[PDB]
Amino acid sequence: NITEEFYQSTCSAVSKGYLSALRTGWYTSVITIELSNIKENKCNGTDAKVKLIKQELDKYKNAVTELQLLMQSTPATNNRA
């Protein structure tokens, strides 16, 4: 049930009938992904399927490397004064 009033005297209008949902607090949850440690596989293979797995595993290792840098960094800090 939304209504509105216009005030000619001050060139303004008020829209009423709304209900609030103001954030007052925070809930912090921890999301986890279980990873595995892999370094220098003793394999060449030189077949099509292992080659696909290896380069996909390279994406994995590079992702882990990048995430390790962000662990060392401090988040955000772009605040007004």
Add this chain to the structure above:
Amino acid sequence: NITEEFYQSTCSAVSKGYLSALRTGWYTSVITIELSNIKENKCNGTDAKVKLIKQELDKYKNAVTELQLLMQSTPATNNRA
């Protein structure tokens, strides 16, 4: 070693102990990707593997088409006056 002073007389505070890292200039480098020229291949092979290759090849040609449009344009500039 971060310290802070509050000045009651002027309602202000100074936080010291920080070190600078100011962007003063720009370095421009050119990144290249080597592509190949391919057009309407008149092949009539029609099994599952070729259809997948064909439609993946269509994505490639569509990417080149879109990139060609961006080459002919002058890149997005959004400045104050």
Add this chain to the structure above:
Amino acid sequence: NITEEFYQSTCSAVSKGYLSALRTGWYTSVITIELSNIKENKCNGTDAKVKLIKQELDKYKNAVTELQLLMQSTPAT
């Protein structure tokens, strides 16, 4: 043919020779994607090809569920 004039008296400059392309209105079009009704999927056989398909169909079913909520809400920017 772009030219520019600087006015020393008022510390200002005008760049002319540009051509307009102003948005004055809106055109609304309806884009549709034809979907199919699947209600989970009951099936046995525990091999790789169906397992990939099962979980891909799970992505499909999860997408419609989310879209159904967005249908019930009112959009705004």
Add this chain to the structure above:
Amino acid sequence: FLGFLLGVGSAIASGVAVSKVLHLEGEVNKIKSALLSTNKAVVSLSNGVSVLTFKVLDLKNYIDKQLLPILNKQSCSISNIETVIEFQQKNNRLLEITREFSVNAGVTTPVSTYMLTNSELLSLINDMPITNDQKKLMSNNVQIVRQQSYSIMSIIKEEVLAYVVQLPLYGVIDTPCWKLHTSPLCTTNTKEGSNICLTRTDRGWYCDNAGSVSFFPQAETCKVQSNRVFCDTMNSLTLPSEVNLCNVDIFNPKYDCKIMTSKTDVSSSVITSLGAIVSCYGKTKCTASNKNRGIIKTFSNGCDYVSNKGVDTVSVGNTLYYVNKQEGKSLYVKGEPIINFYDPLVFPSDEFDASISQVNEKINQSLAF
């Protein structure tokens, strides 16, 4: 307009606190031990905070079993293409999460479906120490919850990737809210530079809150779902409830209504919830139209208004405005423009951030001189 008056806080201070605890010696083991049996557990951290923990992906089990023994060779060959495809499926979510974090310096908002899927988000909401009415609220507005949430990269240590998801809690619900729309009010005399102007600067969202009123000067920060208004109290000023008196009686003694003055009688329109305010001055063409007939009203100089009933568009100069088509009744409250009450000879015509009484005292001082 009054956005510079807001205070300064850090939105993710809570998530950062939990993240730093995860960097503590031995902290990962508590989470790892509690998730060895299930995928969803409630761990108490060393700083005395109770957090819901969620294991959303187990790449370790897959890699160690369906990949690691085959690559711990010697001569390796892969057992069919589905093993490679399924790995790409499993690995993709990790790559996408890393990708978002790497361009957002480890902090993302809104929280993507990669960080937390629609199914996972609904599961979290169900296990939170909140009212069943709060669960239903967040569940029916997950898209809003997402936009007001943060994802903070924390640790990747001892075969565990952990990041903090910071969800909003709405402690103020179902209190009346109202939106104030304002537009310039100028005199309408024919000489070009002979007009004075006045504009209420207190436009924005207002919500009743804890005996006072929460005022959101940047109304753009609030999110509206039907008749529900989602706002963040960090982006608000706390005002006495007497601020509402400015709407009915702008010269009331209880509250000093904020205004700005000028001599710029420029034309514009403000689209409201159920209509449109039109400030038409000078030689500007101002009209209101319907979809079928076209122009049905031509505005004269001054500040006027039309409801959305039977009106689809409003044109001011070369600008076309579409009105909101929401259902509701509008009331036109007649009254003489307060700008007429002022003497243009002593009217302070450049008050950028002032008020009614402040303008009055300046008039008194100029009059005494």
Add this chain to the structure above:
Amino acid sequence: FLGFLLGVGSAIASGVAVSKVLHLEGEVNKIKSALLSTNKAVVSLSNGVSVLTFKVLDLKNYIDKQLLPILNKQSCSISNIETVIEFQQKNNRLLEITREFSVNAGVTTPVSTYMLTNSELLSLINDMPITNDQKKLMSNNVQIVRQQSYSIMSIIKEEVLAYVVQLPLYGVIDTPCWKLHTSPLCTTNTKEGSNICLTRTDRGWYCDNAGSVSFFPQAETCKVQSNRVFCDTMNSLTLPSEVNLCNVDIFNPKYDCKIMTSKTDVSSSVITSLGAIVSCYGKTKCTASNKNRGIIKTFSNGCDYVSNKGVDTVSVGNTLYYVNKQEGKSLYVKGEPIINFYDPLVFPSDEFDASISQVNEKINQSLAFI
């Protein structure tokens, strides 16, 4: 600077109106029936609005026919990995659309290629009821069209997913546009606090439009492609054409030119289309350089200008500016700085949003009192 003078509009009010009509029962059936034979049709809705409809993906046909009967079991087993791969290809677009909508509360801008591919977008433009000059313009600037478009999630009802795409229409094309750059103009007296300042506040994009001039105070909102300027009229004021007189004669009687006054003589530069304005005050080092040669010009205190011909960079204090390298001729119009015409003793030195005549009347009142 004068963005606070702008009106307030609802950007997707038109698209939302169409979306709400789609929620009506049986409205979905009309579109589906008109799209059972073809992929592009014009459907009329129940409130008498006619919209172009476009079917971009048929997952129903794929799933039900080439995939589902193997699952119409009993004991199900799927042959061909290519079937799994092709399904992942088709399903991906749906997942990406859902992904974008779920993180944008059902409204996205710009419109992604998942929402509407480059091929599909070009097809739409071709069927719009507008002049062909609008068609070729939109087709050659599809990346701009995308940035100015909205996608609004509407309905998913048995058994069609429909969303509204709101495309821009350019009703004003090929009219002359010009960009006004302004910078602070101050006196050059030696003491750090003895100076008065003046700045034109009417900077931004200007375009001739319907006998008047559309003025865009926040030039950042406009997108420039070579010599073509894409702007949104919602971000504009409609002004008399006499506003252009402020450029040649700021004291003209026909238009009250807008200025701001201060005593803040800080140094800066404004990079223009074909050069750079330099406001150099106090002890600031202000220079213009060429890449190989180095410094080729040193600015004195006051407001000056250099063209981009032979100039690569401009430095004001510790800030380095790169100039635009576009070709074109610059004209330096000499004239005495108007700030010299004022008496610093009666100069209103804190008018944040004023004008020439308003400053004058303040001077007269202060002068009469003394």
Add this chain to the structure above:
Amino acid sequence: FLGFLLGVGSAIASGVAVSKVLHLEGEVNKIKSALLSTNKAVVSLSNGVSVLTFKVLDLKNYIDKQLLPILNKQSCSISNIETVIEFQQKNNRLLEITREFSVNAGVTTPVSTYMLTNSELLSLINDMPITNDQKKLMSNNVQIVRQQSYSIMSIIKEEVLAYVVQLPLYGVIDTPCWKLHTSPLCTTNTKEGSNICLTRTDRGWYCDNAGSVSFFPQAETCKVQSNRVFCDTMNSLTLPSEVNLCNVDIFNPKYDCKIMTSKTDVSSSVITSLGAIVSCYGKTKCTASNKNRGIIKTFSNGCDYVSNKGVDTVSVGNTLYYVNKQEGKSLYVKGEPIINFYDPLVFPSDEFDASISQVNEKINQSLAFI
């Protein structure tokens, strides 16, 4: 607050300049010739500029050799499924790069890993002709480098896709920086509209730089990593070092400290590095609390401050502020609020952008009239 005083520059003017050179005929051959043997070379362009060149993907070699002869048909047939998957892997980066460019009108920021991987980025940094200390800085802060970088689509001609990546170079490193936080200072009367106010407007980041001070009025634009402050000089004013005197003595003769005046006695808090500034006026409830201990400080009307030691939160009205948990010492410098030095009857109570001396001269004029 004083962001409106900033100059105007063109952020990608340098990259665009290089891009336009690449559009010139024969320019591509030079790049192509230098990259036939290696993937990273320094090519000279036709206008005498030297740029690092980088080949990150060779789709030509893959398509022409391991794909094209199978399509040199006639009857085209694919023997293995691995061929389809491998092609999708190679082709993906190109599709993602095209996707980002197509929704950003050919200019993206920050630079994604699709545009430039972490390995490629680190390789560039190591080969930029820069100080050896700049290399370690950029390498340890690649996420910041990415956010401050641009990727500009240039050309796709003669089987070559080329785009310009514009990376930041930090010419000012390890100079002391400090952040100034300011909040409204008002008289402490409880009844509305009875108060006069004053606020320092020079809040923001400050860094020592080349004998002067770089001032960043909008501190939100700077990125802070621990005690390292990453800022862009384009978002700064260059000020004399005497501006720092405003912190110790706001009435000092050497520098005219910037302030604004008003009658808006609204309540708020500013979270600093090691505490919180609280401006509490009217009937607003203002407190500081510990999570376990509870309320440990209640603010009176006026401007006050609390350190983060033993403090977890600060509450002003209906707004909860979390204090920074960083370790460090705070010094409370006592002194009478300067707003008390003014006569409310001649106090100019609406100066949006003024200063100490400007307020003083305005008081003198009002005082002389009486």
